[PDB]
């Protein structure tokens, strides 16, 4: 009479059916990978890599497929924006079909390993009872894991046999799948240095092999064997749950903060690029350099790439989103069509005014136009009676350099107020919202959703470590206690 929450304990003491259920979970995961890839390819728009990349459309597995080398498709389109001459069998559709067929094969193998559960391999040769030599199993599977880690690091990513991984410029303007040379110096521990990824996966992998050869040759000591409850599968479950939630915390942190393994051309910008003005400073530095060359403001701003300006927009901030604001970023805000340009606000005196940008914390932010010396010179007041820094009172005009509105100046207060309100969000873009019926509230980029999901899983699996490990240590008393 097992309660509904204990049913899957039936395979605790059955190695064969444990293999079967683990095969079934593996088959389900592979099937989900294939199906998700197929759905994403079906609903993906590859026409415009600029202003409409993958992270704008809510793609979740496309970033990873592109990160590890798969770029082309059988539909004739490349994620980089070129033409697919010969995508080969390793296109997105190829990966989806492969993971799907693997899921089916694992389903069949699960059926078999379930029917023929009573294999003599799982019998203890001496006693004849069913038993698993957990130290030796860990040694074998760790040796395999280390071998695979070294192989992936040395051949893949380095491009010796594999294709490499996604490497981009610091500002995410020109990124592509490239081979990576390992970084053997201290800079190999720079999180944003790509060269660490091969070298690590090499060196660590090597250690794994050696570690395997130890945990496969040397039997654990009796004191350690009974202390760590080696020989109980639930102890292994507790330790594995702990390790996996540790890894989940690490990956969530490394994606929220960004690293060489989570490029912004695949997951979108981080919130710390908006907070610290990572792109705004670069744009203004390029503009200033062009001006120092003698160019006018219009030419200097026309020289700015549209993708770089698009990164400098608060709508792409992963932290400007909602828990139930579902779907693609294009579903909340319209599909980007073009860059309006750069708005320069100037009072009737000629003093240049800058619009205070919305911080990541604020859902709504009042519009303030600030002097170069940090002195508020204009605003859109909430109380139009006896206002002091009104747009009409100060006489603010907005001139657009570059983009769609190039060399266009607006002086009517309504248009100036509208454009200042738009510019408080960063660079101003035109959005087509009729196509997807965008409501008008920002969604979160795929890196935000990934971080949220895997952080919640990390917490729940910390509770899993606690529970399954308590059950491990207190196995004798978890069938009941004999009073004191």
């Amino acid at each position: 009479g097992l309660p509904w929450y204990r049913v899957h304990t039936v395979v605790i003491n059955d190695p064969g059916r444990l293999i079967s259920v683990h095969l079934m979970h593996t088959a389900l995961v592979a099937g989900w990978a294939g199906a998700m890839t197929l759905f994403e390819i079906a609903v993906f728009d590859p026409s415009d890599p600029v202003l409409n990349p993958m992270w704008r459309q809510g793609m979740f597995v496309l970033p990873f497929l592109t990160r590890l080398g798969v770029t082309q498709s059988w539909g004739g389109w490349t994620i980089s924006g070129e033409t697919s001459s010969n995508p080969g069998i390793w296109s997105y559709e190829g990966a989806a079909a492969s993971h799907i067929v693997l899921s089916g094969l694992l389903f069949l193998a699960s059926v078999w390993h379930w029917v023929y559960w009573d294999l003599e391999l799982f019998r203890d040769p001496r006693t004849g009872k069913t038993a698993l030599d957990l130290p030796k199993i860990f040694g074998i599977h760790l040796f395999l894991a280390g071998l695979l880690c070294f192989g992936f690091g040395a051949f893949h990513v380095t491009g010796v046999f594999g294709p490499g991984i996604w490497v981009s410029d610091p500002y995410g303007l020109t990124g592509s799948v490239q081979p990576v040379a390992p970084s053997w110096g201290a800079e190999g521990f720079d999180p944003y240095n790509p060269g660490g990824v091969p070298a690590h996966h090499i060196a660590a992998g090597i250690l794994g092999v050696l570690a395997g050869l130890f945990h496969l040759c040397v039997r654990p000591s009796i004191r350690l064997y009974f202390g760590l409850s080696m020989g109980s599968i639930e102890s292994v479950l507790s330790s594995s749950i702990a390790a996996v939630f540790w890894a989940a915390f690490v990956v969530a942190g490394t994606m929220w903060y960004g690293s060489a393994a989570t490029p912004i051309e695949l997951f979108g910008p981080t919130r710390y690029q908006w907070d610290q003005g990572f792109f705004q400073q670069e744009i203004q530095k390029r503009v200033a350099q062009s001006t120092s060359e003698g160019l006018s403001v219009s030419e200097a701003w026309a020289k700015i790439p549209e993708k770089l300006a698009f990164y400098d927009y608060i709508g792409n901030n992963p932290a400007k989103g909602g828990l139930f604001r579902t779907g693609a970023m294009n579903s909340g805000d319209g599909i980007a069509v073009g860059w309006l340009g750069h708005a320069s606000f100037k009072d009737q005196e000629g003093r240049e005014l800058f619009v205070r940008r919305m911080p990541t914390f604020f859902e709504t932010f009042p519009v303030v136009l600030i002097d170069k010396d940090g002195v508020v010179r204009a605003d859109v007041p909430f109380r139009k009676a006896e206002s002091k820094y009104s747009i009409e009172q100060v006489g603010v005009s907005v001139t657009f350099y570059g983009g769609e509105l190039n060399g266009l100046t607006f002086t009517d207060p309504s248009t100036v107020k509208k454009y200042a309100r738009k510019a408080q969000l960063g660079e101003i873009f035109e959005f087509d919202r009729s196509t997807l019926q965008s409501d008008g509230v920002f969604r979160s980029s795929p890196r935000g959703w990934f971080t949220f999901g895997h952080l919640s899983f990390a917490l729940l699996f910390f509770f899993g470590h606690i529970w399954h490990g308590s059950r491990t240590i207190f196995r004798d008393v978890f069938a009941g206690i004999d009073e004191d």
């Binding site: 907070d275 610290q276 003005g277 990572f278 705004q280 400073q281 203004q284 530095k285 200033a288 350099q289 120092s292 800058f354 619009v355 205070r356 940008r357 911080p359 600030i370 002097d371 170069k372 010396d373 940090g374």
Partner: peptide, 28 residues
Amino acid sequence: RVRTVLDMDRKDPAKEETVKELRKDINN
């Protein structure tokens, strides 16, 4: 030739939290 002082004085009004302002702030 870029005027770093003007660059900082442009970033500060739009965003005071910019890394341009905070870097070498005690020097200012």
